[PDB]
Amino acid sequence: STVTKVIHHELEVAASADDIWTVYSWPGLAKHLPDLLPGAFEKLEIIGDGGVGTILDMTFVPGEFPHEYKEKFILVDNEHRLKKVQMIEGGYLDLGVTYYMDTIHVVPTGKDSCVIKSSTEYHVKPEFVKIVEPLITTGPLAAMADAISKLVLEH
Ligand SMILES: COc1ccc(CCNCCc2ccc(O)c(O)c2)cc1
Secondary structure, eight states: EEEEEEEEEEEEEOOOOHHHHHHHHHTTTTTTHHHTTTTEEEEEEEEESSSOOOEEEEEETTOSOOOOOEEOOOOOOEETEEEEEEEEEEEGGTTTTTEEEEEEEEEEETTTEEEEEEEEEEEOGGGGGHHHTTOSSSSSHHHHHHHHHHHHHHO
């Protein structure tokens, strides 16, 4: 057995869903993640063209937990503006977690408005629930949402 946990974040953004989705689905996004989020990375290696199936090997500078993990783009759905990115090696998988999936859904609210609905689902062995609970937060998805919003809006 494992236990399933799901955590959620929303950001309202004063830009269209189309504009926001342009950035989340840009095939160059992975390779530019260090520009988008400066000072995070020690190393970033990308296998793939940025579309579905791309693997990102991410190593973070000392003092960051986790230190390294591999991520894979599982879904990049233009019709529903839905992105799924799986932690496939390392990271929380070395802390009793057997499944880790980030979902990002860009939902239109108005002509020039949308909500970025980010969530994390993980499956954890029961004896590890207490250990991973404070470590797995929406922090990284909220950081990405904040930075994408700012990149679209700010002049
Ligand atoms: C420094 O920036 C980071 C951004 C996000 C994370 C969490 C893992 N990423 C989950 C969603 C995601 C990851 C990579 C992508 O290229 C992407 O488009 C979407 C880590 C670091």
